[PDB]
Structures are given as structure tokens and as C-alpha cells.
Design a protein around this ligand. Sequence first.
Ligand SMILES: O[C@@H]1[C@@H](O)[C@H](O[C@@H]2CO[C@@H](O[C@@H]3CO[C@@H](O)[C@H](O)[C@H]3O)[C@H](O)[C@H]2O)OC[C@H]1O
Length: 189
Amino acid sequence: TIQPGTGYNNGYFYSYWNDGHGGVTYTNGPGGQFSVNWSNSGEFVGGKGWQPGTKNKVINFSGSYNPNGNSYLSVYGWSRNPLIEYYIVENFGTYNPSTGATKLGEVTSDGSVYDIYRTQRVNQPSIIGTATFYQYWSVRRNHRSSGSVNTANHFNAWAQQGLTLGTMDYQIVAVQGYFSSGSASITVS
Ligand SMILES: O[C@@H]1[C@@H](O)[C@H](O[C@@H]2CO[C@@H](O[C@@H]3CO[C@@H](O)[C@H](O)[C@H]3O)[C@H](O)[C@H]2O)OC[C@H]1O
């Protein structure tokens, strides 16, 4: 188990963040592996990947994802200038993050159709401090906890629809939770 923060572990960049609430354990394992076990958590996001991401990375992931409540499993990362939090959501718990959001298209990639959305966070934490910024979403219709994500297909379709990214910051497979419980064990490559 590690403190929230960022660094490298067995060759992979990791980011682990929470809102301080308690109830989440993040573990870096061998190779590209990480595990998250949480019980009546606050908000948190943790996973392994790269710093910086690229616009055409093929990300592979495999393992087990057992949320009990509000949680996502996503390729997750940020761009700078413009500041964007983005999500290629492969699975989730009790909440589809695109509920109520404006649908801005579809993309077919890696065995499923994804629905595309933009949302906005207002004065929320970010990689550069409290800010108001857009989120880009690709929400997979066929949920899964293993597979391959051709991020180019998503970034290109986003750009097509006017969801353009700035300079890439980190890019990970992440388990996210908001006041929920669960376990996950995920291996990235
Ligand atoms: O030490 C600083 C960190 O705390 C900062 O980390 C980022 C803070 O925001 C994270 O994203 C938020 C929560 O879950 C998301 O879905 C919300 O919209 C986000 O508001 C991101 O995970 C962290 O990396 O990074 C900069 C540091 O100075």
C-alpha cells in the first residue's frame, strides 16, 4: 500500500489520489499490476500507466473489477492547455458517468460501440489546482474488465466532434470510486 501521489513502480507510472476521507487501499504489484480495495471510501482515483500519455497508445488491461456502488474502470488521463480530464470507460458500478450528459457521437472500437459525451467540472480539484474544466467521455456499451483500448480511435473521434485535447499529461488505467466499496486487481500493458 502506498500513500496518494505519483511515481514509478516496476517500470510503470502510477497516480493515486483521494480526497483524504479514508477507506481505500491502493497497492502497486509486480509489473503493470495494481490493486485497489476500498470500503466506505470517499473520492479516489488510482491506476498504472504512463506519464505522459500518447495520442495513439494501445492500452491493454486484464483482471477483476468488483465495485459495490459508484465506481468506474477507465482509461483515464489529462491534457493541459486546454485542461481536460478524459475517460474511456470500460466498466462501472451503480452509476453511468454520462447520465444526463449531452451525447456528442458514437465511436466503434475494440469490439463495442462507445457513446461520446462532454461534461464540465466547476471549481473542482485538477492536476493544476482547483479549476473549471471539461471532461471527455467514451462510455463502452458492452462492459468488460479485460481488453485492449486503441486510444487513437477515441481521441480522433473526440477531435472530430470538437472535443480537442491539449498536451498530454498522465494516462493510466484507473479504478475510480466515490463513496462506495469494492475490490479490483488490474494488470496494464
Ligand atoms: O498534489 C496535487 C494532487 O492532489 C493533484 O491530483 C489530481 C487532482 O484531481 C484528480 O482528479 C479529480 C477527482 O476525480 C475526478 O474525476 C474529478 O473531476 C477530478 O476532479 C487527479 O486524479 C489527480 O491526479 O495533481 C496535481 C498535484 O499538485
